[PDB]
C-alpha cells in the first residue's frame, strides 16, 4: 500500500541512501540525492515518491538491504490535488511513524517466509 | 490543506531548487 | 580476439550475406517521418575512454570487446528544475537516444548512419592505448636490480679496508 | 558566516576537522545544513536522537553489530574494531549510529 | 592474551610521542659505525635492524617514534621504511618495556 | 523509391481526412488555424540581424520556442 | 617475428610480441583478459594479489601472469578448469575478511571487487567465523578511510612511492592483522594525492568532497579537457543534471598519462559558487540587473567616446581561442591594438612557435639523458609534468635547477639561484654543461616566470647562447621547452594577441578596458578612472571594479579551443548547460560588435573556427602537435638593439605560484581548495 | 628604404608555410633568409610564421581597422616573395 | 504450407527488429507452426528502408494485420497488401516509433487549451526527464 520510510528504534533513520530502490524501480518513481551528515553518516538531503507514477510493485521494498522503505497496509490515501501525491522525505517519515507497530508486526510474521 | 510540497506557494519558505550560488555585488 | 563462436557468428554472417541499397545522403530522414529540424542537430561519434575507477578493459576498443562501442551523441541543451519538487526539466527530445541506444561497431557504420539521415557529424578517434611498461620496471626482475643503487661497492670489504 | 564557512563534520562517526562531502542542493535557497536542507519543521532531528543514546561498553576488541537484535532484521552484519575506543571517544556503526566502547586494549 | 603491542600505529603516549629526542651515545654511535661497515655504502639500509636493536639495547627495550626517526635520519631514508620494518618483526618492542 | 514512400504517406494523410478518421478539430488545428494565423500576424521589422534577436532571445538557438 | 618479436601461443592462437613483455601482457594481445587487482601498467609489478594465475605447460603449477615472463614458443592457457578453481579459491580468500559494506561503499557501482566476483567467483560463502577488524586514520582533506575493506594490494604505495615521491604509505604489520598507511598520523602531501583513489581497487580509499552524494550510474560522463594549468590533462566531468558530481582523468599517454593533479581534480567545487548570472550594469545603488541589451547599449556609450589605444583589452587565464579571436577582430577594427594578458608577459614576441612552446612534446621528454630546469619549480606549476621528470630521474637522467632551491620530489643539482649563474653556464664554464654537451638527448625547459620578468629578453638571450652552446637544437630533436603556468597564454600567442607598435610605442592612459575573464589584472592596469567592462563567469577581483559585467560560460559549460604548453589544440564540450541568462564568450562579443556598429563576419561557431584556422593553421588540427621550424635564433638576431637596451633586475629565478591550491577564480571560489591551503598552513 | 616603413604601414604581418612542402620551399628559405632583416627593421612590428604540414603558404598583412589583405605566396621564389610584400607595402600606401 | 511433409498451416506473427549498425537495417521475422509437425520454424528476410517485402497474405489471412502493424512501427513498406494503412499509433502520426532512433518520448506532447476549445498538440517538455542508468561492467564478456 502507501509508502513510509522507517526509522530504528532509537530514532535515528534506517535509510543509508544506498540508492538500490531509486535503480529498481521499473517506473522511475523514486529521486534520491544524499550528503556526507555532520556527524559522518551515509543520508539522504531527499527522498521524494511519485504516487501517480508509483506502480506499487513493491521491489522497492525488496532491494533495501536495511528495510528502510516499506509499502505500508493503509489503501486510503486519496487526495484531492495532484501535489498531495507527490511524497517527500518528511512525509515519508510521518508515514513510517504512523504505521510503525503495524508495519513491525507484518514484518516479523514476513520474515519467517522470507 | 495540510501537505504540500516544499515548493508550493502555500509553504512558509517557499523553495526554489537552484543549485548554484549566486555572486552579489558589492554595495555602493 | 580469436572467435566468440556464439551467436554472434550467424549475426556477422547475416552482415555479410545481406546489403543495403545506396540512396542519397539525406533522402531516407525525409522517410523517416521525424520532424526534420531533428537532423539540424550536430553529431559526435565517439567511443567511450576507460572509466579511472575500474581496470577493466570491455568498455574501452580492445580485442577483448565484442561488442558496439562507437556511440552517436547529440549535443547537450538546456535543462533546468522543477519550481515545485525540484527534478530536472528537460525539452530535447533526442536527450537519450544516442547514449543509450545508438551503438555501432566501427567509426565507418556511424557515419554511414548518420551521412545516411543527413546528420552533420564529427568523428573523434579514442586517444590510443599501448600497454607497454617503462624501461625502469619493464619487468618483475627489475625491481631488484643494480640500477636501484648501482652496483655494490666492495671498499667496504676488510681486505679491501686493509 | 554559513554562507562562507568551509562544510566541516562534528566527528561521531569521523574527525572533528574534515571536510563534509556535500552536494549542491540547499545552495540557491541558502540552506548549509544537512537537516535543513529535508526538514522544514523546528521538531527534533533524527541526529538529534542518535546523540542522545549512549556508548555502550563491551568485552573485547571487536564487536558484532547487527543494527537489530535479530540479525534477519536490521542491518547486515558488521566488525568494528574497538581498539583505542573509549566512552568519550567511542566507536560507531555506519549502518545504525550505535555507539561502542571497550578497555580490554589497556590490558582489562 | 595479546602481547605488549597491541597497535599496529603509533599511539602517542607521554613517553612516546613526536617531542621526545633520542640519539646514540659516543661508544653506541661507534658500534653504530663498526656495524655499518659491514655492509657496502651505497647500500646502506642493510643495516637497519642490527641498528634498531642496539636502539633497543640503549633505550631500556622500547623502540619508539624517536628511535626510529633517528635510524631513518642515520640511514638516509623515508622513515615509513623503518616504521615498517620495525613493526613487522617480533624483537621490536614498540611499546613500554620492564627490566626483564 | 523514398519519393515512392513520401507519396504513400502523403496518400495516408488525405485519406485521414476523406475517411473521417481525423475529425473537424483536428483539421481546424493543424492547417486551418496556422494560415489564418499567419495572415493576422502583424510582426515589426527587426533591426537586429537574426544573431542578435536570437542571443537576446536564449542560450541554445536550437531548443524550440513555444506561443512565439 | 622480425627480430626483437617473437611467437607466443594463448589458448592456441598465435600472437607476436616482443620479448619483453610478460604473460599478461601477451594474453592481453590475444584478446584474452586475465583478471587482475594488483597489476597496474605504470606501477610496479607486485604479484601478491594472486589473481592472475593462469597455465604454462612447462610449468609445473599455475604462475602468476604478470611477473612471468613470456618466451618463444610458451603455450598460455586461461581457460582450463584448474585456473577457474584457482579463480575461484582466490576470489574466495579476497571476500571472507572483506566488510559487507557494499550499500555504504562509494565503489559500489564501480567495484572491480564485486564484478569479478559475479564473473570469476562462486556465488555463496562457507565463512562463519570473525572478520577482522581495522581503524581509521585521517590521510589528509581529501582522502576519506575505510581501511577495513582494503584488500592488500600494493598499488597505493608504489604509487606513492614511484610517481608522487612522497614515500608516506607502506605496509605494516606481519600476516592478517598488516595495515597500510601512515604509522603515525600524517596527512597525504603530493598534489597528486588524487591518483590514489582512483588506483584503490576496492574504495578503502575515497574522495571526501564527492561522498555519499551520488552513485556511478547516475552520472552522464563528458570527456573534456582541464584548464588548471598549460598541461591540458584530459578528463572526464561526470554529471547529474545541471550539476558537475566529479572530475576523473582520461588516458592520453602524449599529455596525462592516466594522472590527474588534486586542482584539478576537486576545483568543480567553486563551480556552484560566486557564480554570474546576468548583466549587470553600475548605477549610483551600485552594480544591478540589466538585460543584455541595456548592458551593450552602456557598452556602446562608453565605447563612444574613447578612441584608438584608448580602448584596452586583458585577456585571462581562462579565456578561450575563439572569445580572444572575437575581441581581437572587434577592437582592431575599433582600431585598438592594446591586446595584452593578464600574466604580466604581455610583451613576450609572439614571432616564432619555437619562442614560446614546449618544441619536444611531453612524450619525448622521456628520453631525455639530461634536464636543466630554469627558473621553474615543475611541482607546483604543472604536477603531473614533474611526476613524468620523476620518471626520466628513475630511468637515470641528471636534473640541474638554476632557480631558487625548490622541494622536487627527485633529487637535483641545484647549479644556481640568480640570473649570474645561468649566464655563467651559458658561457661555458660548468661541468654541468659539460654534460648537457655531452648528452645526446639534451633538455632545456625555462619557466613561465622568466616570461614575467622584466628582464626576459636578456634572459631568453642566455638561455638561447647554451642552446647554440651546448647543442640541445639538432637534426631529429629539439631539447628547447617553455612551461606555461595559464592554458590562455599559448592561444593568445598563437592568434597574436600580443600589444601593437603603436601601443608599445606611446602608451595611452586607457579610457575603456575589456576584461576577458582577468581576476589577476595588476592594479596599476586600469586607470581607475577607465570604464571597466568585466566578461566572465566568477565574481571577484575584476568584477567588483566593472561598470558593467558580462556573464560568460565556463569551461564547462561551453565547447571552446585551448592550446597547451606544447601547442597541441584541445578542445572542451558543454557538459552541464549555461546558467541564467550567460552566453558563450564569442557570441557575446560578435553581438556587441553588431551593438557597436562593427559587425564580426563569424556568426556560427564553425566560422569562428575557420577564423581561427586562418590566423593560425594548427588550430585545424585539433588533437595534433605541430612542429616548430627553429626560428629562435634569427629573432635573437633580429631584436639585437632591444636585448642590449634590456637592463639588468635584482630578482632571482623563482615561481610566482604562491600557493598552488588556488591560483584562478574558480580555485579561489571553492571550498575545498580552501580546506586544502588551511591543512598546508598549520 | 621600403624595409623601414613596414612598421607604418602593417599592423601586424602573416607568414603562414608548411613545415615540409615542395610549394613552401620558397616561404621557407624566405622565413629562414629575410625574417631576420625585416624584424631588424621593424623591431614592434609583430611578424608572426605560422606552420602547419598541410597549412597553404601566404603572406598577410592587416592595414589600421581590420583592413586585412591575404597575398598567396605558393610555388614562388625568395624574391618573388620580398616582391609580394613590396606590392603589400604599396597598398598599404593606397589606403 | 502446402508441402506434404512439411504443413506450416499457420503465421503466428510477422515482426521486424531494427539493426542501425547493419546496412540493412531491417530483419522481418515471421513465426509459422505445423500442426501436422508438432514443430515451430522462423523465417528471417533481411531489408533496408526503402526495399519493399512481398505481402504473403494470399498465404495466410493473418498477415494483413501484422504487416500493417510492421510498417507503422517500423517504416517497412509491404508490396501487394489489399490496404496499408497505420493501426497502432495516433491519427496523423509520421514517425515509425520502435525505430531504434526515434525518441522513447516522441516528439509531441497532447493538451487541452481553453483558449481554443479544442484538444492540440505541441512539441514535448518533460517536468522530469527520464533517467538513464548505466548499469555496465567493464569485466562483462557475454556483450556481442
Ligand atoms: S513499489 Fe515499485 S514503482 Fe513503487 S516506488 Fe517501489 S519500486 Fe518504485
Ligand atoms: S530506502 Fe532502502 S534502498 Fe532506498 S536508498 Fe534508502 S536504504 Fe537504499
Ligand atoms: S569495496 Fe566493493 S565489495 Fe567492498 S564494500 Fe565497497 S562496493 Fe562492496
Ligand atoms: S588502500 Fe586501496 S590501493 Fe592502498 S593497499 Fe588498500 S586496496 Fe590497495
Ligand atoms: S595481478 Fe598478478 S598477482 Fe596480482
Ligand atoms: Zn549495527
Given at each position: ?114 | ?28 | ?162 | ?108 | ?100 | ?68 | ?488 597564454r599559448v592561444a593568445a600567442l598563437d592568434i597574436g594577441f600580443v600589444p601593437s607598435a603603436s601601443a608599445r610605442t606611446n602608451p595611452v ?174 | ?20 612542402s615542395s610549394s613552401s620551399a620558397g616561404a621557407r628559405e624566405f622565413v629562414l633568409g629575410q625574417y631576420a632583416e625585416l624584424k631588424a ?55 | ?144
Open positions: 500500500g502507501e509508502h513510509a520510510l522507517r526509522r530504528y528504534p532509537t530514532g535515528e533513520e534506517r535509510c543509508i541512501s544506498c540508492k538500490l530502490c531509486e535503480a529498481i524501480c521499473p517506473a522511475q518513481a523514486i529521486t534520491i540525492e544524499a550528503e556526507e551528515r555532520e556527524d559522518g553518516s551515509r543520508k539522504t538531503t531527499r527522498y521524494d515518491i511519485d504516487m501517480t507514477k508509483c506502480i506499487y510493485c513493491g521491489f522497492c521494498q525488496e532491494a533495501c538491504p536495511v528495510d528502510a522503505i516499506v509499502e505500508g497496509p493503509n489503501f486510503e490515501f486519496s487526495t484531492e490535488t495532484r501535489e498531495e501525491l507527490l511524497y517527500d522525505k518528511q512525509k515519508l517519515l510521518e508515514n513510517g511513524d504512523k504505521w510503525e507497530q503495524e508495519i513491525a508486526a507484518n514484518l516479523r510474521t514476513e520474515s519467517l517466509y522470507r | 490543506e495540510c501537505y504540500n510540497p516544499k515548493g508550493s506557494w502555500f509553504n512558509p519558505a517557499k523553495r526554489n531548487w537552484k543549485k548554484v550560488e549566486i555572486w552579489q555585488p558589492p554595495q555602493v | 580476439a580469436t572467435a566468440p563462436q556464439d551467436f554472434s557468428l550467424a549475426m556477422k554472417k547475416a552482415d555479410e550475406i545481406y546489403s543495403g541499397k545506396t540512396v542519397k545522403a539525406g533522402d531516407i530522414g525525409f522517410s523517416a517521418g521525424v520532424p526534420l529540424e531533428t537532423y539540424n542537430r550536430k553529431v559526435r561519434i565517439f567511443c567511450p575512454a576507460k572509466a579511472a575507477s575500474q581496470s577493466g578493459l570491455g568498455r574501452t576498443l580492445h580485442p577483448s570487446s565484442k561488442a558496439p562501442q562507437w556511440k552517436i551523441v547529440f549535443e547537450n541543451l538546456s535543462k533546468w528544475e522543477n519550481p515545485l519538487m525540484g527534478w530536472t526539466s528537460t525539452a530535447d527530445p533526442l536527450e537519450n537516444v544516442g547514449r543509450s541506444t545508438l551503438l555501432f561497431y566501427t567509426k565507418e557504420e556511424a557515419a554511414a548512419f548518420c551521412a545516411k539521415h543527413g546528420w552533420e557529424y564529427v568523428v573523434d578517434e579514442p586517444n590510443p592505448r599501448k600497454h607497454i611498461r617503462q624501461k625502469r620496471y619493464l619487468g618483475y626482475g627489475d625491481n631488484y636490480s643494480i640500477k636501484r643503487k648501482g652496483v655494490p661497492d666492495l671498499a667496504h670489504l676488510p681486505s679491501n679496508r686493509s | 558566516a554559513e554562507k562562507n564557512k568551509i562544510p566541516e563534520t562534528v566527528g561521531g562517526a569521523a574527525f572533528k576537522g574534515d571536510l563534509r562531502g556535500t552536494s549542491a542542493v540547499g545552495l540557491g535557497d541558502g540552506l548549509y545544513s544537512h537537516t535543513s536542507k529535508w526538514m522544514q519543521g523546528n521538531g527534533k532531528s533524527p541526529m538529534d536522537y542518535i546523540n542522545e543514546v549512549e556508548p555502550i561498553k563491551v568485552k573485547g576488541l571487536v564487536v558484532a553489530s547487527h543494527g537489530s537484535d535479530d540479525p534477519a532484521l536490521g542491518c547486515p552484519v558488521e566488525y568494528i574494531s574497538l581498539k583505542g575506543t573509549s566512552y568519550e571517544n567511542p566507536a560507531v556503526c555506519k549502518y545504525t549510529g550505535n555507539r561502542y566502547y571497550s578497555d580490554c586494549w589497556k590490558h582489562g | 592474551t595479546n602481547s605488549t603491542d597491541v597497535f599496529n600505529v603509533h599511539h602517542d603516549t607521554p613517553e612516546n610521542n613526536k617531542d621526545t629526542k633520542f640519539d646514540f651515545t659516543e661508544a653506541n654511535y661507534k658500534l653504530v659505525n663498526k656495524i655499518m661497515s659491514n655492509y657496502p655504502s651505497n647500500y646502506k639500509a642493510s643495516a637497519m635492524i642490527p641498528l634498531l636493536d642496539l636502539a633497543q639495547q640503549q633505550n631500556g627495550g622500547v623502540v619508539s617514534l624517536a628511535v626510529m626517526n633517528r635510524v631513518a635520519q642515520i640511514l638516509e631514508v623515508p622513515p615509513i621504511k623503518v616504521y615498517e620494518v620495525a613493526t613487522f618483526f617480533t624483537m621490536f618492542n614498540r611499546s613500554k618495556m620492564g627490566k626483564y | 523509391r523514398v519519393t515512392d514512400l513520401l507519396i504513400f504517406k502523403g496518400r495516408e494523410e488525405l485519406e485521414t481526412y476523406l475517411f473521417m478518421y481525423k475529425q473537424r478539430h483536428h483539421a481546424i488545428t493543424e492547417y486551418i488555424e496556422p494560415y489564418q494565423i499567419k495572415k493576422l500576424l502583424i510582426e515589426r521589422k527587426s533591426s537586429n540581424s537574426a544573431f542578435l534577436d536570437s542571443f537576446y532571445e536564449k542560450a541554445y538557438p536550437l531548443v524550440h520556442s513555444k506561443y512565439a | 617475428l622480425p627480430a626483437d618479436k617473437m611467437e607466443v601461443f594463448v589458448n592456441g592462437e598465435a600472437v607476436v610480441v616482443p620479448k619483453n613483455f610478460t604473460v599478461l601482457q601477451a594474453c592481453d594481445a590475444a584478446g584474452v583478459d586475465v583478471p587482475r587487482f594488483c597489476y597496474h601498467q605504470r606501477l610496479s609489478i607486485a604479484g601478491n594479489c594472486r589473481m592472475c594465475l593462469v597455465e604454462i605447460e612447462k610449468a609445473p603449477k599455475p604462475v602468476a601472469s604478470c611477473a612471468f615472463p613470456a618466451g618463444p614458443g610458451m603455450k598460455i592457457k586461461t581457460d582450463t578448469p584448474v585456473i577457474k578453481k584457482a579463480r575461484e579459491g582466490v576470489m574466495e580468500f579476497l571476500l571472507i575478511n572483506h566488510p559487507l559494506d557494499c550499500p555504504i561503499c562509494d565503489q559500489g557501482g564501480e567495484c572491480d571487487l564485486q564484478d569479478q566476483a559475479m564473473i570469476f567467483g562462486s556465488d555463496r560463502s562457507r565463512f562463519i567465523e570473525y572478520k577482522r577488524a581495522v581503524a581509521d586514520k585521517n590521510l589528509g582533506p581529501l582522502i576519506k578511510t575505510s581501511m577495513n575493506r582494503c584488500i592488500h594490494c600494493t598499488r597505493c604505495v608504489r604509487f606513492t612511492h614511484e610517481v608522487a615521491g612522497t614515500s608516506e604509505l607502506g605496509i605494516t604489520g606481519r600476516g592478517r592483522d598488516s595495515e597500510v598507511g601512515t604509522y603515525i598520523e600524517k596527512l597525504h602531501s603530493s598534489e597528486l594525492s588524487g591518483n590514489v583513489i582512483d588506483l584503490c581497487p576496492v574504495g578503502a580509499l575515497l574522495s571526501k568532497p564527492y561522498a555519499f552524494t551520488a552513485r556511478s550510474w547516475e552520472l552522464k560522463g563528458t570527456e573534456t579537457i582541464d584548464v588548471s594549468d598549460a598541461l591540458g590533462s584530459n578528463i572526464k566531468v561526470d554529471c547529474r543534471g545541471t550539476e558537475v558530481m566529479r572530475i576523473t582523468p582520461r588516458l592520453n599517454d602524449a599529455i596525462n598519462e592516466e594522472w590527474l593533479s588534486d586542482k584539478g581534480r576537486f576545483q568543480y567545487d567553486g563551480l556552484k559558487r560566486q557564480r554570474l548570472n546576468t548583466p549587470l550594469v553600475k548605477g549610483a545603488k551600485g552594480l544591478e540587473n540589466a538585460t543584455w541589451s541595456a548592458a551593450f547599449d552602456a557598452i556602446r556609450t562608453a565605447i563612444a567616446g574613447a578612441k584608438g589605444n584608448e580602448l584596452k583589452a586583458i585577456a585571462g587565464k581562462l579565456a578561450d581561442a575563439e572569445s580572444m579571436i572575437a575581441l581581437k577582430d572587434l577592437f582592431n577594427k575599433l582600431g585598438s591594438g592594446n591586446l595584452i594578458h593578464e600574466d604580466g608577459s604581455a610583451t613576450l614576441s609572439a614571432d616564432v612557435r619555437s619562442s614560446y612552446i614546449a618544441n619536444t612534446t611531453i612524450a619525448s621528454i622521456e628520453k631525455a639523458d639530461v634536464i636543466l630546469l630554469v627558473g621553474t619549480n615543475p611541482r607546483f606549476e604543472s604536477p603531473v609534468f614533474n611526476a613524468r621528470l620523476r620518471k626520466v630521474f628513475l630511468d637515470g637522467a641528471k636534473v640541474g635547477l638554476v632557480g631558487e632551491k625548490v622541494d622536487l620530489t627527485y633529487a637535483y643539482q641545484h647549479l644556481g639561484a640568480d640570473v649570474a649563474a645561468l649566464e655563467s653556464l651559458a658561457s661555458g664554464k660548468g661541468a654541468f654543461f659539460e654534460a648537457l654537451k655531452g648528452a645526446k638527448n639534451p633538455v632545456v625547459i625555462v619557466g613561465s616566470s622568466v616570461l614575467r620578468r622584466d628582464d626576459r629578453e636578456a634572459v631568453l638571450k642566455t638561455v638561447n647562447d647554451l642552446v647554440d652552446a651546448a647543442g640541445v637544437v639538432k637534426e631529429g630533436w629539439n631539447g628547447f621547452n617553455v612551461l606555461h603556468d595559464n592554458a590562455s592612459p586607457a579610457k575603456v578596458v575589456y576584461l576577458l575573464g582577468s581576476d589577476d589584472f595588476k592594479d596599476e592596469e586600469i586607470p581607475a578612472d577607465a570604464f571597466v567592462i568585466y566578461q566572465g563567469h566568477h565574481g571577484d577581483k575584476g568584477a567588483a571594479r566593472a561598470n558593467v559585467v558580462l556573464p560568460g560560460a565556463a569551461y564547462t559549460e561551453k565547447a571552446s579551443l585551448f592550446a597547451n604548453t606544447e601547442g597541441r589544440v584541445q578542445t572542451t564540450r558543454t557538459a552541464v548547460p549555461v546558467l541564467g541568462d550567460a552566453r558563450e564568450d564569442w557570441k557575446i562579443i560578435r553581438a556587441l560588435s553588431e551593438v557597436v556598429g562593427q559587425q564580426l563576419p563569424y556568426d556560427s561557431q564553425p566560422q569562428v573556427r575557420a577564423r581561427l584556422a586562418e590566423v593560425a593553421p594548427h588550430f585545424a588540427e585539433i588533437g595534433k602537435a605541430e612542429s616548430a621550424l627553429w626560428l629562435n635564433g634569427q629573432y635573437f638576431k633580429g631584436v639585437k638593439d632591444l636585448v642590449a637596451k634590456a637592463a639588468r633586475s635584482t630578482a632571482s629565478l623563482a615561481t610566482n605560484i604562491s600557493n598552488y591550491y588556488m591560483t584562478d577564480a574558480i580555485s579561489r571560489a571553492s571550498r575545498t581548495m580552501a580546506k586544502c591551503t588551511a591543512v598546508r598552513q598549520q | 628604404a621600403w624595409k623601414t616603413a613596414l612598421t607604418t604601414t602593417f599592423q601586424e604581418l602573416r607568414i603562414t608555410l608548411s613545415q615540409s627593421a621593424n623591431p614592434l612590428l609583430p611578424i608572426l610564421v605560422r606552420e602547419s604540414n598541410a597549412a597553404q603558404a601566404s603572406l598577410t598583412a592587416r592595414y589600421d581597422f581590420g583592413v586585412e589583405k591575404k597575398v598567396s605566396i605558393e610555388n614562388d621564389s625568395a624574391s618573388g616573395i620580398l616582391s609580394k610584400l613590396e606590392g603589400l607595402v604599396k597598398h598599404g600606401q593606397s589606403l | 504450407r502446402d508441402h506434404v511433409n512439411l504443413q506450416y498451416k499457420t503465421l503466428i506473427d510477422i515482426t521486424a527488429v531494427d539493426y542501425p549498425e547493419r546496412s540493412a537495417r531491417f530483419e522481418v521475422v515471421y513465426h509459422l507452426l505445423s500442426p501436422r509437425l508438432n514443430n515451430r520454424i522462423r523465417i528471417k528476410v533481411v531489408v533496408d528502408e526503402v526495399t519493399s517485402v512481398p505481402s504473403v497474405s494470399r498465404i495466410w489471412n493473418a498477415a494483413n494485420w501484422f504487416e500493417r502493424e510492421t510498417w507503422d512501427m517500423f517504416g517497412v513498406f509491404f508490396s501487394n497488401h489489399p490496404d496499408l494503412r497505420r493501426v497502432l499509433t495516433d491519427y496523423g502520426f509520421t514517425g515509425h516509433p520502435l525505430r531504434k532512433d526515434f525518441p522513447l518520448t516522441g516528439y509531441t506532447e497532447v493538451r487541452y487549451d481553453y483558449g481554443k476549445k479544442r484538444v492540440i498538440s505541441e512539441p514535448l517538455e518533460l517536468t522530469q526527464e527520464f533517467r538513464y542508468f548505466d548499469f555496465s561492467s567493464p569485466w562483462d564478456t557475454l556483450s556481442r
